[PDB]
Structure formats: structure tokens, C-alpha cells
């Protein structure tokens, strides 16, 4: 290919920029031009495409968000829509396209491909739940943002011997919850992937109470409910003072950590490769510490599961 | 003196441990024994006191919160209950008490003195609302956890061209906001110290939209309502995709920044200084960049304010 | 005043931006086109002056360094160059100027006022060695970067019961060293503004090591010597395991801390007000929590000096 | 088994405590009571033991260093010492043992075993230079600590157009330097695992300084020489002012990132499981995101290497 493109759709996440720079340079290294697609798919259809000069991506490897922006486009859900984009692409000479974002980005990746247009997806989401990859760009950066709050909230959670409930993110996934909570010495972690009996969860609270430790920290994935509620439920069931904190989009910003800047660069570059190599309709990820690339279709077919043994661990490591 | 105790009442802030250490150290440097009145005034009644050794308050200078704990206590706001207070101090041979906390702690220091117990107060609250001190221990730290969150949020707020409403603490004061907002370059800071107007805001909030900047950050001093409400408000009035984030208690925990460590050590050291110099019914606080002494009563009679000129600058600079 | 300029000369410092931002924004608020001279006075000669828009300075309030770039240039010390300087100044129609940077620039700020051209200076530097202000842009940020490192070191030093000697910057000034350790928890702070007897330093580390603390953090202001040397002299006299760590320009960068961003804003805005209020040859700064402004003359006549009362403190809380 | 011991030998790293934590909790949860051996093998020999109460490992899962302490100890390399230890252990009813640390401690791990003693390894070191694992407790934290420093240096390096050299640790391994550079975006990384023509290097820099790449950052693993040398050496041949910073031991301290807490917890209790699951003379680790365990012997017999692909990747993403 002579020139390819890059766009980021879905919720932004820390590291996408790394991935952007990776893609841009790695491409520029093989003497390929990279055009930037602004405002995710929406801009694709709108025809928002500016040539990305090597100058543009240097100096942002350490930045949160996406210099390319990312919107939500409904039009890009219909033939007539995808087509109007597949043309705007050709309009500028573009021959392939790199997509960085959530699983919704893949839907387009696939369709766009089913129309005879080379598209690879790079997993970029703090939720850590795109299939075909153990981690996603932004996960370590969110997990670290969270455990960092769990640490600050633990200082004061101890000071007033209060019981705490942090509300994380990762929608229908318990990853930012599990990994995080474990990482924080969370007395209990509530995630989708596994069942929890709110009664027992309140029994141990009373138990671990007698044991001397009056401050407890409950980590709840927003996927299984709402901290706010769980808060009141615990305060009334027990009697222990209680506060509730919903971190928020803070789990979406900030400069990315080591692991995410690397992963972003390795995957981002591993995408430019699959295109120039002819392959299309592929998604790049990392499994068992190894760069893998799958079929967006057979890839989405799978489910997102967590390591139950970890949820288990976190249970035995807090009594 | 011979023996002097220390306690932390009210909401814990970053820098108390620092101030504690500075007391436990400054006093020992004068052969004065100290004591920990644990769990705020709750212990001063319960008799939860202990001896503090220089090896105890050492290595805790960087820790958020208070080792001595804190908790509310109504029995003390009375008299019949505060009588067991002076006694739990007598029986132990304590002569002077160093109080660290909010405007509410000062009370248990204004009454104890008017009872024959030298008491000194040390501003330890993130709100920055204590009278008789430009800055209270914890402020700069909290004030920093806030801007460190504004920075992650502007990330995801810039990538999605969204409008934001940040809910910052500080109860009835607008310091944690006016400052952070200004620091984090917000487009609008709403504090109880100044009359705003959603009509004037939504007017400027829009001009900036069409002008060029499609994302805005709105810091709201939790003392003017809720963010959620302004969120849903900004939303309905503009159609603008909006989100709200309530940082919350994270602003209370964390490792104190440099400025609180230095202040918590200077104030806990100027406080102990008085419990020796004799006068024991005062409270310390850095005023005009100088350590000053104040009559717990002649100071608490004052009202905390903000630098209008500073708020007026947030107006000019942000537009 | 209808079109002022803004350049930065000297070592960059986390904050210079919050200020450039503040300068421009403020200026525009008053209808005064703002141009930026790149690479300090050096560029002023070259005529490296470009117009600045409110957009240019949008989203840099939280970045370190100076987007305006900085650089040395002896030229501007010889009036032959100063002559070439006023040239580029009126060549582009620049009436007034705002110098951000170390004191090495102040000199050039005064001179320009003599050639009949406005010139206000903004104290920007991590050393905190500019007369006329208690704090300079970059101090608190740098002052922080350090303590973050002492916290880190303290861990590795503790587990290995080792004696350490960190080396902070600040030229001939001791500020960075002083506030660092004090908040850092150092046992010794060697600064230029105070005398020390290495014999005493050993006498302490050798007495403390005999007691409970089997590790210490010796902060050494780069201005008095080199940590690599005291680290040698110390591991010789005491025979204690020792390591020396020299914090580099990691102190020169980072993202301005709360206190810093604000100060920069305040000092930068007030910088524009002066130029317009017809003043000149002055220089803003903060003294006694008040926004002051002196003449670049009567100021430099004064001399920067740490607060001994704090050093003696740094010594007392140690023992 | 009813009683086991845990010890930290070798250079401390962030996460060791978190790892201690699980080895203590996982034990308690299984009835086994765990005795903590302070000061590594040196402490074993001296008989420094103490029962680890469940409340001891409480609130340390976010701390650096090792609550246990570490030291180097030749006496254990001799036959006289290994016998002194087998004796001290069997004196306090110790049946198995937990050893966390570098490849050094692994030795004694394998020793104690031959002398009939169940010991399990746990990769603890920021070097990531230990065999039988893709990662070691500390790598990640040191990895960010490095990239955070590179982000600051990039600021001043940029403001002044300075070519920079950063000397990172890792003894003989190039892991820290590889990932750091790759993730900090170093224009050139130098390591022990791959040759480098210090000529080509210069050549590239000489080409960038012309292509607006007026500033670069070189990462030198310490096991490839001193950055101070390469520093002056680059300045000499090119002429661009250069600066060198040796992060020193700030790479060893500070609180551990999310990952390291997850890995340590996972590994610790995984070691504990082996002591009970009747194993021994083995070492746990994480290869290909799988908690596998190996024999301390055949494992140490193996060698450590880096991923050439990354280095190559690091050379393309930089020009
Ligand atoms: O406000 P938004 O943009 O819809 O994002 C909320 C959701 O998106 C994410 O931020 C990313 O998927 C999730 O963590 C969360 O459930
Ligand atoms: O949950 P609590 O105990 O009311 O504490 C939160 C409140 O207290 C403070 O932390 C201190 O006054 C405020 O900032 C805040 O409004
Ligand atoms: O980065 P340079 O140009 O070598 O200068 C180092 C000196 O400049 C400063 O960064 C600022 O004065 C000092 O801290 C230090 O002594
Ligand atoms: O001065 P020390 O404590 O021996 O440490 C230097 C070596 O130890 C480590 O800190 C840990 O192995 C390495 O980074 C380095 O090679």
C-alpha cells in the first residue's frame, strides 16, 4: 500500500496516542503515508481527513485521549452509510485503515472489510474486554488510576474507621474491578463474572469487624449495580459508618503507564504490518505474552471471561 | 511543661501525620513527653491514650491521614461529658493538648482552656476554611489531587468534545474550587462566595462552542448544590453531550504534597512552642507567609473568605 | 499598549506555560495582540517573533517547559545586540514586553526599559533565587519532584538500612535543598546559607545509627558541593554502607503543581496589567501572600536568603 | 506442614511487601502459621525470627521496600553457614520457607533444599533479570518510575533543544532500558543484549537535528557503560549541548503499580501452595501470562534474554 489511514472510535482511552504514533511512524518507516481520520467514524463519512506528517505524532507518545478525536456515528450502521465513508476514503487515495477503539470499532472494521476495504482493529479501551486479547490499550492505565484512588481513599478510610465502597468502571466487565480490587487489598470485589450473596458479604464485614480492622473497602464493578445503593444496603444491614465514591471518567484520562505505551506501540505497529502484508479484516491483540492477530468475526464470536482463580484468590487473601 | 498530648479531631487531611511528628519531635527536643489521644475527642473521653516515642512518629511524614485516628463525639460538645475529658487527662498527668483539625475541633480547645487545660489548635482540613490562616494543612494536597483529576478528565473531555461538571469538596468554602479551577484552567468556577447565573454561563458556555473549543470544564464547589444537577441542567439547555464527575473523598486521602509537609511541620512545631512559652488557648496558622498566633476565640469569630480579585481573574482568563 | 510580546529566557521551569497562557489570555482580554519571541532574547535578535492566538495558548496550562522555547545568548549583553533587539521589536510593531525566566534575564529586562521600551519580568525558575518574590514559577513543582524521589529512596534505603546522600539543584541558593529535606524527612541538610562541620554530620549519623534509625537521608544542596563526594567522605569515616543519588533535571520538568499553576497565572496576568498601566522596568512577584511589583533595580540590590528559623527547625525535628 | 517462614534477599523492589502479604494470608487461610525471617539470609543465620500475625501484613500492599528487610550474606554461601541456618530454622519449628528476591537468593533457595528443606522462589527485583518468568516483582513499577522521569526530562530537553542521555539501571539486563526507552520514546536505546555502532548513533542524531528533531533522548542501560561518558562523548562529536541524568535508586523505591501488586499476590500465595501441595526446590513465575513453576536448579541453569523484536521495533519507531 501507498497510503493507509487511522481512526479511533469508541470511548477514548490512555495509550491510543501511543498506538497512533506507532501506526504513523511504523508506517512512515516502510515508506507509507498515513492519513488521520478525525472524530471516529463520524468524520470518516463527513470527510474529515488530514495527512498525518511524522511531525504530528512525535511528542504525544505520553498523552491521554486521541489527537484524532472519537465520536459516535449512527449513520455508520447502514450499508448506505459505510459506503459513503468507503468513498471519502478513496477520495483521498487511502487504501487501508487502522481502527483504534472499543468493540464497536470492530463492527465497522468488519463491515468496512466486507465491502472490500482493508481494515484492522487495534483494541483500545479501559474496560479490557475486547475478545482475542488478554489486555487492551488503556487497561493498565485505568487500573493504576483506580488503585491509586483506593490508596488515597484507604488513608481516610482508616482515619475514621469507616467502611468504603468504590465504584469502578468497565461496564459489563469485572476486569478494572477484579485486577484493581485485588491490587488494592479490597476486602471484597463484586463483579459480573461471578456470583455474590449480599448477605454473606455482610457477614464477613461483621466478622472481619470483630477481628479488629474497623475500616473495610468494597470494590464494586459498575457492571453489577451501583455503589450508591450497595452503600446504603451495607450501612443499614450492619450499622458501620459508610461513604461511597464513584471514581468516574478519571479512569479514562491521564498519561498512559509503561505497559500501555508499549502495548499501544507494539499493536499499533503490528497493525500497519498486517495491512502492507495484504491481510484485512484482522484485529491485533496480545495473548499469553504474544502478538496475535485474529479474524474480527471469529474474534468477536468468543466471550470475555476473567480468571476465576483470581476472584478466588482475592477471597482467601482477605479474612 | 512535663507532659503534653496530641489528637486529631474532625475530617482527616494530608499533613496531619506530618504535624503530629513535628509535635512529637519538637517536644522531645525539649525533654517533654508527649501522648496520643487516639480517636479524636472520642478517646479523650474513652481514655484511649498512649505514650508516643520518637520512633513512632518517625517514617510517617509522607503518610496521608492520621495515625492517631479521628471520630466524632457529641459527649464532648456538652459539659458533663467533657468533664471526663479533663480527668482522663489529669489521671495521665497531661498538662497541655495540641489539637489538629477543622473549625469544630477548635471548640474542644476553646472550652478545655476555659477549663484550665492549655490547648493549641493546628489547622488540619482540606476545605481551607479555618479562620486565622491563609492555608490549612491538607489544602495544597487536596487542591492537587483535584487538578490531577481535572487533567485526566480534560483528556477524555477533549477526545469526545464533551462538556464537564466536576464536583469538588470544601463544604461551605470555595477554595478547593476557585484555586483548582484556576489551576486546571476551567471555563467556569462556581463557588458560594460569588453570585453566578446559569443564564450568564450557558451564554458564554455556548459562544465558546461555536467559536472553536468544543469542550468545557465546570468546577463546582460542592457548596452550591450538586454537579449532577448542573450536569442535567447544562445538558437540557444546550443539547450538549455532558458528563459529571464527583471526585469526593479521594480529595481527603493521599500523600501530602511538599507544601503541606513543610507547613504541617512548621505549625505543629510553632504550636508545641507555645505549650511551653506558656500561652495555651491559641491556634497556629501561616498568615501573610508568617507563623502567627491567634486567640482560638478571637479568631473563630472571624469568617473565612476568598480573594475576589482571584475569582475575577478566573473570569478574565477563562473565555 | 496595543501589541505586547512575551518571551522566556533562562532555565525552563514547570509553570512558565501557565503564565504564557495567562499573559496572552489576559492581554487579549484587553484587545492587545500578543506575539511570542522564541528562544529567549536570542530569538529577539534573530527576529524570531510570531503572533500568538488564544488558541495557541489553549491547553498548555498543565505542561512543563516553555512552548516558546528557551536559549542562551551572550549577544544581548552587548548593546550591539540590544540594538538589533529593539529593531526586531519595532519592526513587527511590538510596543511592550514580558520577560519570564531566571534573573539572568531581568538584566536584559531592565536595559530594554532604558532603550525606552516597556518590560515587566516574571520570576520563573526552580532555584527560587530571584529577589523580589518569596517564590518563583517552578519552585513548588521542583520542590515536589524531589520529595517524590526522597519518598522513593526512603523505601530502598530503609529495607537496606543504608545511609543516603541526595543532591538537589538550586545553584548557589539553598531553598530546594531546605524545603526538600524538611518535607522529605532528611536528618541533615547542607546548604550554602548555613555552615556545617562534616565532623558533626558524622557525629550524628554515627549516634543515630547506634540508636534506632539504621538509615538516613542526607540532602545536599548542589550549591555547597556534590553528593558523590560527601557520600564518599561519609562511607569512609562511618564505614556505613552508602549510596549517592543525583536528581538531575527531572527537577526541571514535570507538570506544574497546584500552587504553581495558580501563581503563574496570577503573576502573568498582573504582568500585562503593568505594561498597560504605563509602568515599566518593573517585575512582579509574591511577597507576604500579596501580589507585589518592584523596579528591576532596587530589587536586584537586595539578596535572596533562606529562612534560618526553618533550617534550625530542620535540625531540631531530626535528632 | 503447620509452620513456614518467608524472607526477602537481594536488592529490594516495589511489591515485595505485597508479595509478603499473600504468603502470610494464604498461609493463615490454610491453617499454617507463617514466621517472618528478617534481614534475609543474614537474619536467618542470626536467628532473627518473629511470628507474622495476620495484622502485620495489613496495610503494606501498597508499600515499597520490604517490611522484613534485606542484606547480602556470604556466610550462607559457605558450608558453615548453610548449617547455621538449617539449625535456626529447625529451632523455631520452621518446616518450609519462602524466598523472594533476585537470582542471588535463589541459590540459597536451592541450598536449603538439598539440606532437606522445602523452599520456593519468588522473582523480586526491578531488573527483570531472573530466569523462569517473563516478569519479576518490581519491573513494572521501575518501568514507570523511569518513564515518568523521561517525561520530565523531555520537557527541559525540549525547551532548550538539548540532546539527552539517561542512565537507567538493571545491572546486566537491558529490560529496564528496553521498555523504558520504547515507552518513553527514546530516539536511541543502548543495551547489553544488542551491539551498537556508537558511530551510526551519532550519524542519526546529526540527521535529526536538521529535520526539526532538534532534541533527542538516549537511554543507556547501566550494564553498557556510564551515560556520563556517552554524554560528553556525544557532545564532543556532535556539538549539541548534552545533559546526562542517572536516575539512581529512585528506580528501586516508591509504592508499586497495579501490576506488581497483582503479580506478587498471585506469586506469593502460589509459593505457599507448593509448600503445602508437597513441592519444594521450585520457583514460581509468570511465563506467557500463566502462573507456572519450575525447579530452582534447571531454572537457574537457564539464561535470561530480551526480545530482539522489541529492540528492532524500538529502532523503527525512531528516526
Ligand atoms: O460516558 P460514556 O462516554 O458513555 O462512558 C461510560 C462507559 O464507557 C467507558 O468509559 C468505556 O467503555 C466505560 O468504562 C463505561 O461503562
Ligand atoms: O462524609 P463526610 O464525613 O461528611 O466528609 C465530607 C465532607 O467533609 C469534608 O471532607 C471536610 O469538611 C468536606 O470537604 C466534605 O464536604
Ligand atoms: O541545565 P543546565 O543548563 O546544565 O543548568 C543547571 C542549572 O540550572 C538550573 O536548572 C536553574 O538555575 C539549576 O537548577 C542548575 O544548577
Ligand atoms: O547499589 P546497589 O544497591 O548494589 O544496586 C545496584 C544494582 O542493584 C539493583 O538496584 C537491583 O539489582 C540494580 O538495579 C543494580 O544493578
Number of domains in chain C: 2
Atom in ligand 1 nearest the alpha carbon of residue A172:
16
Using the CB atoms, write b or e for C209-240: b if 16+ within 10 Å. Answer: beeebbbbbbbbbbbbbebeebbeebbeebeb
**Which residue(s) pair with B36 in the sheet?**
B6, B50
- Rounded distance between C-alpha atoms, residue D305 and residue D132, angstroms: 11
Active site residue A148: no
Residue ranges making up the domain that contains C120: 1-141+256-302
Catalytic residue among D12, D127, D175, D293: D127
Atom in ligand 1 nearest the alpha carbon of residue A13:
11
Residue from B161, B145, B150 nearest B185 by CA:
B150
Contact assessment for residue B309 and residue B317, using Cβ atoms and an 8 Å cutoff: no
Residue A170 CA: distances (Å) to CA of A94, A128, A174 = 34, 7, 6
Nearest residue CA, atom 11 of ligand 1?
A: A11
Q: Which residue has the cell 501525620?
A: B17
**Quick one: C309 exposed, middle or buried, by C-beta within 10 A (0-12, 13-18, 19+)?**
exposed
Residue from B179, B178, B143 nearest B263 by CA:
B143
**Same domain membership, residue C146 and residue C131:** no
**Same domain membership, residue C67 and residue C31:** yes
Q: Cα(A171) to centroid of ligand 1, in Å? A: 7
For D8, phi then psi, to 5°, come to -115, 110
Contact assessment for residue C147 and residue C36, using Cβ atoms and an 8 Å cutoff: no
Question: What beta strand segments (E) does A64-214 contain?
Answer: 97-101, 119-123, 163-167, 188-190
Contact at CB, D254 and C65, closer than 8 angstroms: no
Residue B56 CA: distances (Å) to CA of A257, B61, B68, C248 = 35, 11, 11, 33
Residue A20 annotated as part of some ligand binding site: no
Secondary structure of chain D as H, E, C letters: CCEEEEEEECCCCCCHHHHHHHHHHHHHCCCCEEEEECCHHHHHHHCCEEECCCCCCCCCCCCCCCCCCCCCCHHHCCHHHHHHHHHHHCCCCCCEEEEEECHHHHHHHHHHHHCCCCEEEEEEECCCCCCCCCCCEEHHHHHHHHHHHHHHHHHHHHHCCCEEEEEECCCCCCHHHHHHHHHHCCCEEEECCECCCHHHHHHHHHHHCCCCCCCCEEEEECECECHHHHHHHHHHHHCCCEEEEECHHHHCCCCCCHHHHHHHHHHHHHHHHHHHCCCCCEEEEECCCCEEEEEHHHHHHCCCCCCHHHHHHHHHCCC
Q: Tell me which chain D residue has its CA closest to the CA of residue C64.
A: D155
Q: Which residue has the cell 511538599?
A: B258
For D149, phi then psi, to 5°, come to -65, -35
Residue D125 annotated as part of some ligand binding site: yes
**Which residue(s) pair with A218 in the sheet?**
A165, A188
Nearest bound ligand to CA D11?
4
- Rounded distance between C-alpha atoms, residue D18 and residue D137, angstroms: 9
Task: State the cell numbers at D180.
Answer: 523504558
Q: Which contiguous run of DSSP H or E holds residue C218?
A: strand C216-221
Task: State the cell numbers at C308.
Answer: 534560618
- Rounded distance between C-alpha atoms, residue A159 and residue D133, angstroms: 39
Contact assessment for residue B97 and residue B120, using Cβ atoms and an 8 Å cutoff: yes
Q: Cα(C136) to centroid of ligand 3, in Å? A: 15
Contact at CB, A252 and B69, closer than 8 angstroms: no
Contact at CB, B313 and C151, closer than 8 angstroms: no
**Same domain membership, residue D169 and residue D111:** no
- Rounded distance between C-alpha atoms, residue B44 and residue B81, angstroms: 10
Dihedral of alpha carbons B44, B48, B52, B57, sign: negative
Atom in ligand 3 nearest the alpha carbon of residue C169:
14
Q: How far is CA B163 from the centre of its chain?
A: 29
**Same domain membership, residue C230 and residue C103:** no
Contact at CB, A262 and D61, closer than 8 angstroms: no
Q: Which contiguous run of DSSP H or E holds residue A88?
A: helix A79-91
- Rounded distance between C-alpha atoms, residue B229 and residue B243, angstroms: 11
Question: What beta strand segments (E) does C222-288 contain?
Answer: 242-246, 282-287
Interface residue A315 vs chain D (CB under 8 A): no
Residue from A67, B159, B216, D150 nearest C64 by CA:
D150
Active site residues of C: 127
- Rounded distance between C-alpha atoms, residue B81 and residue D16, angstroms: 47
Nearest residue CA, atom 11 of ligand 3?
A: C11
The torsion region of residue B40 among left (phi > 0), alpha (psi -120 to 50) and beta comes to left
Contact assessment for residue A251 and residue A169, using Cβ atoms and an 8 Å cutoff: yes
**Same domain membership, residue B198 and residue B170:** yes
Q: ∠ CA(C129), CA(C132), CA(C134), 5° rounding?
A: 65
Look at strands D96-101 and D119-125 and give their pairing. Answer: parallel
- DSSP-derived letter for residue C101 is E
Contact at CB, A316 and D147, closer than 8 angstroms: no
- Rounded distance between C-alpha atoms, residue B292 and residue B288, angstroms: 9
Strand, helix or coil for residue C50: strand
- Rounded distance between C-alpha atoms, residue B39 and residue B27, angstroms: 21
**Same domain membership, residue C41 and residue C112:** yes
Contact assessment for residue C22 and residue C51, using Cβ atoms and an 8 Å cutoff: no
Over the Cα atoms of chain C, what is R_g? 22
Residue from D66, D57, D50 nearest D8 by CA:
D66
**Quick one: B202 exposed, middle or buried, by C-beta within 10 A (0-12, 13-18, 19+)?**
middle
- Rounded distance between C-alpha atoms, residue C172 and residue A19, angstroms: 44
**Same domain membership, residue A146 and residue A128:** no
Interface residue D8 vs chain A (CB under 8 A): no
Catalytic residue among A12, A127, A260, A293: A127
Question: Which of A155, A252, A253 lies nearest to residue B64, judging by beta carbons?
Answer: A155
**Which residue(s) pair with C246 in the sheet?**
C167
**Which residue(s) pair with C282 in the sheet?**
C295
**Same domain membership, residue A117 and residue A95:** yes
The torsion region of residue D170 among left (phi > 0), alpha (psi -120 to 50) and beta comes to left
Task: State the cell numbers at C195.
Answer: 555552615
For residue C25, which residues of chain B lie inside 8 Å, CB to CB?
Answer: 316-319
Q: Which residue has the cell 523452599?
A: D119
Nearest bound ligand to CA B101?
2
Nearest bound ligand to CA D253?
4
- Rounded distance between C-alpha atoms, residue C285 and residue C99, angstroms: 13
Q: What CATH number does the domain containing C65 carry? A: 3.40.50.450
Interface residue D62 vs chain C (CB under 8 A): no
**Same domain membership, residue D311 and residue D188:** yes
- Rounded distance between C-alpha atoms, residue B14 and residue A152, angstroms: 10
Establish whether residue D171 lines the binding site of ligand 4, counting it when its CB lies within 6 angstroms of any ligand atom: yes
- Rounded distance between C-alpha atoms, residue A315 and residue A309, angstroms: 10
Name every residue whose Cβ is closer than 8 Å to that of residue A116 and which is 6 or more positions away in sequence. Answer: none
**Which residue(s) pair with B100 in the sheet?**
B8, B122
Q: Which residue has the cell 547506634?
A: C210
HSE at residue C95, side-chain half, CA atoms within 13 A, is 14
**Same domain membership, residue D54 and residue D38:** yes
Atom in ligand 2 nearest the alpha carbon of residue B125:
11
For B86, phi then psi, to 5°, come to -55, -35
Q: Tell me which chain A residue has its CA closest to the CA of residue B242.
A: A249
Q: Which of C70, C249, C304 to mutate to test the pocket of ligand 3 (most atoms within 8 A of CB)?
A: C249
Contact at CB, A184 and D262, closer than 8 angstroms: no
Contact assessment for residue B62 and residue C151, using Cβ atoms and an 8 Å cutoff: yes
Catalytic residue among B12, B127, B260, B293: B127
Q: How far is CA B316 from the centre of its chain?
A: 28
Contact at CB, B269 and C185, closer than 8 angstroms: no
Interface residue C160 vs chain D (CB under 8 A): yes
Contact assessment for residue B62 and residue B260, using Cβ atoms and an 8 Å cutoff: no
Name every residue whose Cβ is closer than 8 Å to that of residue B39 and which is 6 or more positions away in sequence. Answer: B46, B48, B68, B69, B70, B71
Establish whether residue C174 lines the binding site of ligand 3, counting it when its CB lies within 6 angstroms of any ligand atom: no
Strand, helix or coil for residue A169: coil
Task: State the cell numbers at B226.
Answer: 450538586
Dihedral of alpha carbons B54, B58, B61, B64, sign: negative
- Rounded distance between C-alpha atoms, residue B288 and residue A117, angstroms: 67
Contact assessment for residue B265 and residue B291, using Cβ atoms and an 8 Å cutoff: no
- DSSP-derived letter for residue A14 is T
- Rounded distance between C-alpha atoms, residue A113 and residue A132, angstroms: 18
HSE at residue D249, side-chain half, CA atoms within 13 A, is 28
- Percent helix, strand, coil in chain C (nearest 5)? 40, 20, 40
Interface residue B270 vs chain C (CB under 8 A): no
**Which residue(s) pair with A285 in the sheet?**
A292
Establish whether residue C249 lines the binding site of ligand 3, counting it when its CB lies within 6 angstroms of any ligand atom: yes
- Rounded distance between C-alpha atoms, residue B171 and residue B103, angstroms: 12
Name every residue whose Cβ is closer than 8 Å to that of residue C15 and which is 6 or more positions away in sequence. Answer: C64, C124, C137, C138, C141, C256, C260, C261, C263, C264
**Same domain membership, residue A74 and residue A33:** yes
Q: Which residue has the cell 476557585?
A: B178
- Rounded distance between C-alpha atoms, residue B16 and residue B125, angstroms: 9
- DSSP-derived letter for residue C137 is B
For D46, phi then psi, to 5°, come to -70, -10
Q: What CATH number does the domain containing D176 carry? A: 3.40.50.460
Q: Which of B56, B181, B258 to mutate to test the interface with C (most CBs of C within 10 A)?
A: B258
- Rounded distance between C-alpha atoms, residue C111 and residue C297, angstroms: 10
Residue from A257, D55, D138 nearest C156 by CA:
D138
User: For chain B, which chains pass the contact test of at least 3 CB pairs under 8 Å?
Assistant: A, C
Chain A window 164-223: which residues touch D at a Cβ cutoff of 8 Å? 179-180, 182-185, 211-213
- Rounded distance between C-alpha atoms, residue A85 and residue A76, angstroms: 8
Q: Angle at which helices C16-29 and B308-317 pack, to 10 degrees? A: 80
Interface residue C159 vs chain B (CB under 8 A): no
- How far does chain A reach from its first CA to its final CA, in angstroms? 58
Name every residue whose Cβ is closer than 8 Å to that of residue B168 and which is 6 or more positions away in sequence. Answer: B146, B176, B177, B180, B219, B220, B221, B222, B247, B251
**Same domain membership, residue B262 and residue B233:** no
Q: ∠ CA(C266), CA(C267), CA(C271), 5° rounding?
A: 115
Name every residue whose Cβ is closer than 8 Å to that of residue C265 and which is 6 or more positions away in sequence. Answer: B182, B183, B313, B317, C18, C19, C21, C22, C61
Question: Which of A160, A245, A253 lies nearest to residue B155, judging by beta carbons?
Answer: A253
- Rounded distance between C-alpha atoms, residue D134 and residue A290, angstroms: 11
Atom in ligand 1 nearest the alpha carbon of residue A252:
10
Q: In what order do the strands lie in the sheet with A242-246?
A: A188-190, A216-220, A163-167, A242-246
- Rounded distance between C-alpha atoms, residue D272 and residue D32, angstroms: 10
The torsion region of residue B72 among left (phi > 0), alpha (psi -120 to 50) and beta comes to beta
Amino acid at each position: 500500500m501507498k497510503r493507509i489511514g487511522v481512526l479511533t472510535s469508541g470511548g477514548d482511552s490512555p495509550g491510543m496516542n501511543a498506538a497512533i504514533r506507532s501506526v504513523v511512524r511504523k508506517a512512515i518507516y516502510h515508506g507509507v503515508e498515513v492519513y488521520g481520520v478525525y472524530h471516529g467514524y463520524a468524520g470518516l463519512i463527513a470527510g474529515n481527513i488530514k495527512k498525518l506528517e511524522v511531525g504530528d505524532v512525535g511528542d504525544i507518545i505520553h498523552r491521554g485521549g486521541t489527537i484524532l478525536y472519537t465520536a459516535r456515528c449512527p449513520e455508520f450502521k447502514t450499508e448506505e452509510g459505510q459506503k459513503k465513508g468507503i468513498e471519502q476514503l478513496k477520495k483521498h487515495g487511502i487504501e487501508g485503515l487502522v481502527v483504534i477503539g472499543g468493540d464497536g470499532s470492530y463492527q465497522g472494521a468488519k463491515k468496512l472489510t466486507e465491502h472490500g476495504f482493508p481494515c484492522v482493529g487495534v483494541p483500545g479501551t479501559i474496560d479490557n474486554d475486547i475478545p482475542g486479547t488478554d489486555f487492551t490499550i488503556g487497561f493498565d492505565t485505568a487500573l493504576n488510576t483506580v488503585i491509586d484512588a483506593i490508596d488515597k481513599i484507604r488513608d481516610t478510610a482508616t482515619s475514621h474507621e469507616r467502611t468504603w465502597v468504590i465504584e469502578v468502571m468497565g461496564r459489563h466487565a469485572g476486569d478494572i474491578a477484579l485486577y484493581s480490587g485485588l491490587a488494592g487489598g479490597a476486602e471484597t470485589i463484586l463483579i459480573p463474572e461471578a456470583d455474590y450473596d449480599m448477605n454473606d458479604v455482610i457477614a464477613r464485614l461483621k466478622r472481619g469487624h470483630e477481628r479488629g480492622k474497623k475500616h473495610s473497602i468494597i470494590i464494586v464493578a459498575e457492571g453489577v449495580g451501583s455503589g450508591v445503593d450497595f452503600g446504603r444496603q451495607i450501612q443499614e444491614a450492619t450499622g458501620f459508618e459508610t461513604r461511597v465514591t464513584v471514581l468516574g471518567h478519571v479512569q479514562r484520562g491521564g498519561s498512559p503507564t509503561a505497559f500501555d505505551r508499549v502495548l499501544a506501540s507494539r499493536l499499533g505497529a503490528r497493525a500497519v504490518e498486517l495491512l502492507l502484508e495484504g491481510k484485512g479484516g484482522r484485529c491485533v491483540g496480545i495473548q499469553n505474552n504474544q502478538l496475535v492477530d485474529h479474524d474480527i468475526a471469529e474474534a468477536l464470536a468468543n466471550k470475555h471471561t476473567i480468571d476465576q482463580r483470581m476472584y478466588a484468590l482475592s477471597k482467601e487473601l482477605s479474612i
